[PDB]
């Protein structure tokens, strides 16, 4: 009773963003802020085709948008983002409760940069 | 290898409850349920039923213990039974043993076992679901959902608690 | 029901748990939403002897679903020959099958 | 190097019960003039050892009247699960984050039950029949009155994880908010354990020993073993409660300092009440719970489920 | 149907036949009863956790609310008899008759 | 009048334990019905997002739902900040 | 003379104290200096198998800044 | 794995403690020393008969409080919930209902310890 | 027994049995079944005497067994359908699993042995409750499960419930014994036509209870337990004795009694539906239970029977608890055939 409609092993090859959770969640409210566009009608296609072989292209979409981000924070402040990152994953929990003084040092650079 | 203990812990469970139903002395019977329950526990645990588990642990190590209550207040006797007293319970017991030690042999042969209804030899771990939870157990949203779906839940069980105390008392009264 | 108060007098009483694509807890989907939602709009006023032929193809799919009798028995099947010619020796799994 | 850990959960806390009964006889003798042991090395450290030793090569006796499998099964279960029992405690890194650490432990507290029935039975006295019924009903009738206070309390931390129960604590000592509820949990704790207040096993006019009679040497001091492990297992859980304590995650030093002093102060308060008070009647011990703890225990966890509701201060749930 | 499911229905089945069949002793018997819904309650537990049936998951301690209530009037039974009979061995449990 | 008061004063001193409980117990049901906090609280359980806003297909005149994330019209916890 | 069960109390404090640091320690040793990660839900549990496959050494503690991508 | 580790060292380790303990010691092996005891005799021919009771209905009540106490362990989870009032009006009743069979076991001598 | 106590007894039984006959979900209608077990223990151990406490012992197993039984069938046919609806089963051996749970509780195959022996434990008023009451809720989840029965297994469970209550009545005496026998064929009576159309087993469901009530409260009227006690009261209450035998002329179904009505329609429906081998067995046995029937009536009223000289005392005391219903619930027990059509009101 059918078959398959498996995309080629050359369709679900896109650069898989490699980081880690800390730098994820370190990055997180400007990453959707700046990124949403393309994630929002990402998942808006899995929810509606609820059919992700019909949505690949929304995520070669996202993932290249999120590494554009990544790219720009990397050409700016990125120490103050390193220390930020380091001192989320020292948490057992990445609480951004006990990282607020970096977090400053952090949302000033993208504020007054990009 | 340790791969086959979701399977194992059931093969526990099961030879655990032949001596508890093998009807030896009523504390070995409590013994093979108490065995029977700590490694069910597991089999519920391991599935992702944390509360579940931790719930039936909990009661159920309190329900064995009243039965015991009276086990030694309304059961016990000059001599109590051992569990090598009678000898048709050491037939049970093995009657026990070869029974499911036959069938998973064919379900590890055949994979096709026909008794009673269609089972598959092939492990347990299949069954479970990938995806996701989000950061909500899926278990205890859903049993904490009793008091705001449970609507006639709770209510019906509370009467029979209440008439479950009172019953208590008017059988026991004594005139 | 016997004496179906609950559509009658207009409450749910115990409708809200029978089957598991009501609105669950924060809207926690069951394993077989998708079958179960296709078998019961199937077979909505159709009568149940006669329901039960014309939404049949959904019934074994939605019981598949649950019980992946049939998918595990593929599985089984791929893993006694897989086994067999191993032992007998002609290929080695591609090393995504090892690490 | 996780096995590793486990042997420094389980030795430490072996040298701890093994110099708790140094301590209790010291502070129970000064507390009624006496000395206490300073013979055995300086100051008696050296005494719980002697004592270890001698009941080590004791003769342990087998009760004729007896089946030796309960015998030796009841050891094993109120020592092994005493020690398992302080697996989910959160030091300032606890060792296994279980999600229902409070309930684990709640429940495995429950077990001692299966220890004491099989000891005061499987020995066949007098003394120990009478006993095992007589404290299984303690403990079994206090357990009630835990886990309805575990509950109330639980209810404003946020859930059953017992690691961010500090993070509930944080600024106030959580007695602060439920001392009336507290002043119970840990009076019903002296009841779990079976302590001069509340024993009532013991009872050495009419019980004697109540379950460890017939035990000798090895077996029996295995008892003694769960025993005073509990008493400081349950003054430790008592102590994070309700005591809480800073814990800065760049020095977790800090909190383990703060958290072992709790736990030596609430012993000490244990020994405190065990060396003045006179012992409770069977009689008086239930009336104690059922006529007058479990209706105000029933009352206070209402308000302290309301509470939350009405304050818009329900807490966190993750 | 993997090997669980045979395993605690076997239990069940096992059960069934333990406490049905007699031997000689009623607390005995109902401890096979109790044990009985333990093997439901862990089998019930299964499809339910298994399926995502959230709201289903309150089932399993609902079912055992009310099935330790048979235990505590089974025991509660048992000590009835037992004043008068002298033990629970139903042997002598003949009085009823005709 | 006379006979409730001492019927009271009676208990308070009789069981004791008996009118702190009922006491207790009776502003525990009563109490949150009259308190003006609960509605907020319902509103700080509702505000927790446990799963995924999935968005809307767009297709005109719903200016209610905001376009983007950042936009301002839309539903705002700001009560949740002051709180 | 209470300070002679000062002693007797004080060895008890350390034997209560090593638990503490152990368990810290050990953690902080196992995970690069970090503490550990704890998984309380799924969301976490595939945050660390993320992370793990990530890191390329199988080791979740192990983590790579933007460094690591272009 | 590594919680049943821990369990298993656990067990194991009680286990050598009870095994030290049980066949280390030498003992004569004489007779007279099985006769039981009791604060100088011996228990007749007692210690095993049926116990003529009382707190049995203390026993019981324990379990048909305790299948309450499981039915409301739920309750930090179901706090966070968002009809929050149907939640309190429906715990208040399952305070209430052990309240009341509290009270019901009190009057009706019930938790008063048979005589 | 506190009065007050009684009443909160009475009416957990009722509404276990009307949880089961409202509910849809399946474990609501488990709920309703140990409710009512729950329930009726108390009562049944009213008069506190050692037979009450064999018969309640007997009760409580046997219940406890067919309700866990109820569970298996309930988690089975979850496990192979997902549904807790109550509807035609998905599983067949679920269904049979049921069939047998269910039939434990009603006393119809081999499962019947717990009925005649509680009925003689417990007293008269209790043996009302129990062989009325305690039957609408099976026979509501019986008919609710029509789709999907095994005929076959229903109609030979049918065929030894009819067949073991007439024999088992004819060697007793006690007249409990001889009313739950009775009881036990018309179960048999009722089940066999179950299947078919439960409009028919609805209907002498109805018929079988209102002479029910119309029996026990004639006895507990007269106050006897054996034949010989009931033959002593053919003196005192002599319009009670020969309602006694008018009504033991509806038991059987001799027309134009209210007793034949069910037995006429429930073969009229199975020979429309070409058994017509089947209804000529519970036609033959029905002899089986007049021939007791007659018997007790030889006893009470057809015969005079030797009294006793104290007994003419009683003469000078009348029954003073009314037992009220009794009038209706006769005449509603002997004369409703010329009202047949009225069947067509429960479809
Ligand atoms: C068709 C549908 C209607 C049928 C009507 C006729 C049959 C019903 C039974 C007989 C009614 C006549 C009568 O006198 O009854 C009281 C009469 C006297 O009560 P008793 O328990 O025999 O003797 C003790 C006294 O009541 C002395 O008092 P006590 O303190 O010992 O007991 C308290 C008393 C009630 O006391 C009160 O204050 C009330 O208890 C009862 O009446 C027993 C039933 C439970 C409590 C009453 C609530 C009924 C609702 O009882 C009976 O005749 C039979 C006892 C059970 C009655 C209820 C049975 C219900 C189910 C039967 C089938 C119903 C139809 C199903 C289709
Ligand atoms: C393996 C099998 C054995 C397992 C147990 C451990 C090893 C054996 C025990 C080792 C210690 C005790 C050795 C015997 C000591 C003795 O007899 O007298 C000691 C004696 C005690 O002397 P004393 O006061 O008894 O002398 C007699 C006094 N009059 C005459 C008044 C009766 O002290 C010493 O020998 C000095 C050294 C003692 C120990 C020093 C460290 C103490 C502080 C740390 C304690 C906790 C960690 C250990
Ligand atoms: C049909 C009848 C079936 C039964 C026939 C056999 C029994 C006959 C009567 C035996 C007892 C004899 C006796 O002395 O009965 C006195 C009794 C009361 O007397 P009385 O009040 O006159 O009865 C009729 C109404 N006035 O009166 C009777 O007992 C007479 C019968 C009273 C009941 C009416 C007949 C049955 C109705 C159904």
Known sequence: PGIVELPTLEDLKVQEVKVSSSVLKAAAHHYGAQCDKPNKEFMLCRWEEKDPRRCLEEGKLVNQCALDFFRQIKRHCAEPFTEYWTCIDYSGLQLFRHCRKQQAKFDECVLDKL | ?175 | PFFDVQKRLGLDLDRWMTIQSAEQPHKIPGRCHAFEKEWIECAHGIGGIRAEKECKIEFDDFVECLLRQKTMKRLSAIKRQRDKLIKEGKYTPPPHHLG | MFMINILSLIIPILLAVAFLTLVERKVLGYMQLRKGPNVVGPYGLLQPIADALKLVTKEPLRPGTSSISMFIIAPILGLSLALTMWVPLPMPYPLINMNLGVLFMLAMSSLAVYSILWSGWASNSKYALIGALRAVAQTISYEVTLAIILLSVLLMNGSYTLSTLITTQEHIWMIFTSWPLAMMWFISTLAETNRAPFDLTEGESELVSGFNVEYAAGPFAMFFMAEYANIIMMNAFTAILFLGASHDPHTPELYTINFVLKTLALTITFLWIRASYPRFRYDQLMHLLWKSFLPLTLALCMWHISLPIMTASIPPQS | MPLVYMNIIMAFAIALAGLLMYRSHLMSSLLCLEGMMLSLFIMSTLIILNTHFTLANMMPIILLVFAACEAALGLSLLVMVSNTYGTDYVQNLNLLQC | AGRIASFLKNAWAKEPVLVASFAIGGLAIILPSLSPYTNYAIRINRATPYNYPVPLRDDGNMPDVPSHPQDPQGPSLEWLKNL | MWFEILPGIAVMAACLFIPGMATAHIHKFTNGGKEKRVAHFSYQWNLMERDRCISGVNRYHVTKGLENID | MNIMLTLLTNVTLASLLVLIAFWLPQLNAYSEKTSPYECGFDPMGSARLPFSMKFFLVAITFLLFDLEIALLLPLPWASQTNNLKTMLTMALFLLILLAASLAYEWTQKGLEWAE | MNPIIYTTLIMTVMSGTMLVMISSHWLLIWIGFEMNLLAMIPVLMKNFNPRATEAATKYFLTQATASMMLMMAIIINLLYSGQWTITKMFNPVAMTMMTMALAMKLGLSPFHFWVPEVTQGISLQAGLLLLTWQKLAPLSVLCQISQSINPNLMLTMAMLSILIGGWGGLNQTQLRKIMAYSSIAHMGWMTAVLPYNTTMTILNLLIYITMTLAMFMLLIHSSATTTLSLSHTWNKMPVITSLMMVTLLSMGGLPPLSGFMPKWMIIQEMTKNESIIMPTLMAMTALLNLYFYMRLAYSSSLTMFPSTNNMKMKWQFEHTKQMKLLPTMIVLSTLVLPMTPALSSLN
């Open chain 2, 1 to 175: 290898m340790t791969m086959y203990i979701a399977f194992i812990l059931s093969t526990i469970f099961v030879i655990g409850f032949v001596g508890f139903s093998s009807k030896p002395s009523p504390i070995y019977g409590g013994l093979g349920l108490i065995v029977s329950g700590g490694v069910g526990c597991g089999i519920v645990l391991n599935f992702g039923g944390s509360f579940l588990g931790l719930m039936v642990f909990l009661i159920y190590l309190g329900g064995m213990l009243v039965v015991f209550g009276y086990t030694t207040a309304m059961a016990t006797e000059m001599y109590p039974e051992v569990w090598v007293s009678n000898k048709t319970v050491f037939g049970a017991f093995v009657s026990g043993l070869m029974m499911e030690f036959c069938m998973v042999y064919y379900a590890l042969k055949e994979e096709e076992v026909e008794i009673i209804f269609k089972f598959n030899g092939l492990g347990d771990w299949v069954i479970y679901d990938t995806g996701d939870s989000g950061f909500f157990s899926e278990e205890a949203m859903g049993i904490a959902a009793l008091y705001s779906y449970g609507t006639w839940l709770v209510i019906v069980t509370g009467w029979s608690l209440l008439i479950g105390v009172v019953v208590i008392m008017e059988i026991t009264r004594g005139n």
